[PDB]
Design a protein around this ligand. Structure first.
Ligand SMILES: OC[C@H]1O[C@@H](O)[C@H](O)[C@@H](O)[C@H]1O
Ligand SMILES: OC[C@H]1O[C@@H](O)[C@H](O)[C@@H](O)[C@H]1O
Ligand SMILES: OC[C@H]1O[C@@H](O)[C@H](O)[C@@H](O)[C@H]1O
Ligand SMILES: [Ca+2]
Ligand SMILES: [Ca+2]
Ligand SMILES: [Ca+2]
Ligand SMILES: [Ca+2]
Ligand SMILES: [Ca+2]
Ligand SMILES: [Ca+2]
Ligand SMILES: [Ca+2]
Ligand SMILES: [Ca+2]
Ligand SMILES: [Ca+2]
Ligand SMILES: [Ca+2]
Lengths: 152, 152, 152
């Protein structure tokens, strides 16, 4: 009765403390390699790797390569690319069917931000996608090394 | 009443497990680029930038440049400077009124740890402040590049 | 009473939110320098240091040097070492009594994964332990520099 009321106030204090502490912790974690947008979080590893290796790193970490699905997400991702001044790989490829880019699941793109003239499968060997510091996309050979950015 | 008790008992167990997990992840987070002191957390980006750019990075991240307000805070900040072996910028400047250093809010300093002979406005143009590996402060030209350390 | 009911229900909602948000941040934190195994978390500083320096870094951060106590923990640590491609120091040494490796607490090893013929106290001066990218252990001079990996 009167006891439960006291225990509740104690619990209330514990939760409010956690909310304040967690909020501060989130800001700390995201500085300087992460960006939060909606319920998605982009985070860069800070180094470059070929597509296959970059892809494995994200999947093993429980996430996947950056997959911007809107202008808002693309802008958030662009911030990390600008901050590191290094173009990054996206998760999408047209390795299965040339000319048709898809997400790792197989789904067709729901949003794109291709630079003028892209994708152009230059040299007949560009199945991966990179995002420039200006936010635009370009298909690029998967063997090339680009900034690793995963989404969680 | 009775059901409410077990409900409170259960929820608190969950909150305390969350507290324990959060405490562990906070220690992990701070290693090796952060330092906690009181309710404040200092975290370095690991690279150098001129004052204006450094200031923007911290503000955009939801914090501000390191602003040690006591010997204890200065000591905590010093650890990061020593770890990176790179002097860092503080948030304070005397741009508005020469010789009068203030925090971003305009408030006058409540603590200082100037090195002997400082501040001296060398060349007649040193309005920013840097902290050395020995913990002492020195006014420095804002255009120079120093370690970026923010506080949250 | 009905008020306490509402309060308890309110807390349940706040806790569910924290649980979900924290779960996401745990994954974010561990990328790309951490590894979780059981209730233990290994995290690398990303650089090399001699044993004494490495040990101090971990202890001051509230943890200790990597101390795999099972094949499962050793495999998890190995994943991290492979990712960084740099042999790392473990916490154990036989500095007190030659030939008898112990944890920082003085307790004898409960698990080991020595490479064939090791430990061999090569040159009569190897009291520290390093873990290779293949997961095997080798006693090594404490003065040498190895990847710093702490456990929390
Ligand atoms: O390697 C340079 C080339 O890379 C291609 O991906 C691009 O479509 C070309 O316009 C050119 O920039
Ligand atoms: O650039 C070197 C100079 O930097 C000034 O900030 C300092 O006051 C001088 O004593 C000298 O060290
Ligand atoms: O420094 C090279 C040597 O290092 C020792 O620790 C090892 O036992 C030897 O087999 C040899 O590899
Ligand atoms: Ca193709
Ligand atoms: Ca193609
Ligand atoms: Ca192209
Ligand atoms: Ca972190
Ligand atoms: Ca001035
Ligand atoms: Ca001045
Ligand atoms: Ca000066
Ligand atoms: Ca010995
Ligand atoms: Ca020995
Ligand atoms: Ca040996």
């Amino acid at each position: 009765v009167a006891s439960l009321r006291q225990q509740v106030e104690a619990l209330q204090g514990q939760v409010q403390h956690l909310q304040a502490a967690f909020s501060q912790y989130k800001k700390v974690e995201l500085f300087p390699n992460g960006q939060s947008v909606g319920e998605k979080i982009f985070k860069t590893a800070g180094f470059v790797k070929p597509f296959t290796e970059a892809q494995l790193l994200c999947t093993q970490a429980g996430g996947q390569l950056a997959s911007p699905r809107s202008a808002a997400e693309n802008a958030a991702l662009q911030q990390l690319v600008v901050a590191k001044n290094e173009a990054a790989f996206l998760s999408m490829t047209d390795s299965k069917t040339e000319g048709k880019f898809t997400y790792p699941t197989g789904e067709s793109l729901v949003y794109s931000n291709w630079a003028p003239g892209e994708p152009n499968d230059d040299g007949g060997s560009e199945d991966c996608v990179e995002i420039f510091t200006n936010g635009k996309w370009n298909d690029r050979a998967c063997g090339e090394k680009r900034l690793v950015v995963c989404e969680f």
